[PDB]
Amino acid sequence: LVVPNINSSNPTTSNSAPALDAAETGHTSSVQPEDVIETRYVQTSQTRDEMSLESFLGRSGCIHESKLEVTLANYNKENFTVWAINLQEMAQIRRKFELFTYTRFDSEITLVPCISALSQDIGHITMQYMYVPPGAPVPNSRDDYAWQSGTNASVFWQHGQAYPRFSLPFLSVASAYYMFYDGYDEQDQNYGTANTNNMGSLCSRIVTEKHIHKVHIMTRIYHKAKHVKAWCPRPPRALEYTRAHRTNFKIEDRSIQTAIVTRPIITTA
Amino acid sequence: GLPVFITPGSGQFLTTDDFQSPCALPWYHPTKEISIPGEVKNLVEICQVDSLVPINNTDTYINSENMYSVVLQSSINAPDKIFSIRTDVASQPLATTLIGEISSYFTHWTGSLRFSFMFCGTANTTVKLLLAYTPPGIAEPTTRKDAMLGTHVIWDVGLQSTISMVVPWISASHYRNTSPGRSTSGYITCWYQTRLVIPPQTPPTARLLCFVSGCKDFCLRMARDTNLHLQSGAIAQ
């Protein structure tokens, strides 16, 4: 997808002139560059394809941070985590999607598991993940029967294995994910995306049995939206995030220092 | 199995890769795309939208609408400067425009920019004004005649509301870098071509609002995680 060439534009003046408009119409202003420059013809021939949605959305980024410690004293209980799936707590990805009313995409999901040693060695280690759609029984324990997964998407990683990935199709009960919402679940709390965006949760858990090595596991989890579509653009976030689902921005004991920077006088660039 | 052998670049994850991948959720089927209004394919349609510059970026206006606006003084017999700005798309204040942010999400830019201006003062009032552009390698102008040597438009403030005009693309290179460090793209500069004349007992004042958008000429490359916004620490929930 390309710009047109630009023609040569003859130096002229006339009673006809498009340089004037009514921006108040809502329509964008007097469109044409050849109107006020006596141009030479140029093969303006620079592709917009990097500017495509399947480009701009369609680069991966990190989403969330599954940090865990391997507890010893009840290894069997504690050594798992669960995270509520959202695009709302890493700013760059958030701001890609905080750009529209709604968006739809299939998802590359990519896992960057990392083991950090608090001990002289780590040995072999294996780690489980599960997508927990809502109303799956959430694992309560590193020994919970819920680690069995006859139909839940559960996947494994271990020391020395390559980065896991999967393709997750577009999920919503609706046509597109709400980037924002203007009301409630029907009895009137959780205003906005905390209503609509119940994807349930990701989960993780050490699969190797009790062993002597005190370790931290950290998974950085990444995603890229592809086969994307998006719906009615909306203005970018001006200030630091605060509250995942909620658009809150007035932070506690703080002030609204936006991306705009002041200057001494408006006659000085 | 087929005799195969493995090239470097294997076994990495690249956040900007491109490949097929296996399904986590086979046999699933997505919801149908109903015909929602407000389709989009590219960022350039957002670039085509006129957005206001917060032109008047100072303490006395920043926490308000007024940084989008400038005030004019019908009292003055002078040719002199009303305002000026850079033209580098990710410079202050322009970066804060939506084209600014989209450019700030990018490293290369090209093509001419549309600029637009409404005489927001009292309908009974008249003026003509100079809007001008400075091709760089040179200081920002200090007389109206300097700007008259630059490419410029004189605004016939007729019945029609708005003058709209273009900074021509005059980069040496087909692109320019989106944010300058120790670098420049040129200046917007604005001047009293006539004095502003209100008729008697009108408010001794006028307002001007200023707009920009990408022309049909406009394009970007090297999408990059934008300068414009910062996250400190964890985003709470």
Binding site: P169, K226, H227 | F19, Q20, Y28
Partner: peptide
Amino acid sequence: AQVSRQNYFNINYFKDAASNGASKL
């Protein structure tokens, strides 16, 4: 068939179509 912008043939092979995650313009 071959790639329209290009000079070679390549096409899907992974099972379910949504899982591809790579689109034309």
